Amino acid sequence: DPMYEQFLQRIQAVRTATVAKDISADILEARHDYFGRELCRALDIEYRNNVLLDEIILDVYPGVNLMEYNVPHVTPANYIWTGDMLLILDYKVSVGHDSTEVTYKKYTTLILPVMQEIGINTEICIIRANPVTNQISIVGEQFKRLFPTIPVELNFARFFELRKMLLDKFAD
Numbered sequence: 453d454p455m456y457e458q459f460l461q462r463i464q465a466v467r468t469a470t471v472a473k474d475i476s477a478d479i480l481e482a483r484h485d486y487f488g489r490e491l492c493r494a495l496d497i498e499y500r501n502n503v504l505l506d507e508i509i510l511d512v513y514p515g516v517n518l519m520e521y522n523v524p525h526v527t528p529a530n531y532i533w534t535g536d537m538l539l540i541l542d543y544k545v546s547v548g549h550d551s552t553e554v555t556y557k558k559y560t561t562l563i564l565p566v567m568q569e570i571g572i573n574t575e576i577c578i579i580r581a582n583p584v585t586n587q588i589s590i591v592g593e594q595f596k597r598l599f600p601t602i603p604v605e606l607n608f609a610r611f612f613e614l615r616k617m618l619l620d621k622f623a624d
Contacts, residue, residue, distance in 0.1 A: 529543060537575060
């Protein structure tokens with residue numbers, strides 16, 4: 453597994469906590485992306501890794517008069533367009549609620565006002581996996597409606613093992 457081996461090489465090479473904090477950041481992002489990929493495959497929805505909100509608008513409403521709107525330059529993880537409603541998607545891997553609430557509120561603040569101006573009915577959806585228990589939590593009523601079951605097969609062990617190496621290397 454190349455992703456694992458690349459992290460391992462950085463972890464064995466790293467000598468200082470400050471450089472190691474960048475590795476930890478990257479491991480957490482890779483874990484986020486891994487979950488997003490598995491979720492999307494299980495639901496048979498398209499996996500994207502951060503799309504500009506301008507791109508989303510043009511995909512769903514190519515005929516929009518884009519110049520007339522002030523579109524915040526935000527990049528959500530993904531989206532689903534049903535033909536009537538746009539579900540803005542992000543995923544989290546965390547044992548707690550807190551990072552989900554932060555992102556949900558950020559997406560609500562930056563995305564929903566302009567989508568309302570444009571006239572596209574839009575909802576923020578965040579799907580969270582608990583990395584220890586593999587249980588899934590969803591915020592987003594329409595997302596729950598469309599996918600009442602999520603048949604993901606999750607295994608976060610390789611991410612924990614890598615983070616545990618970093619913790620052990622810098623335990624002092």
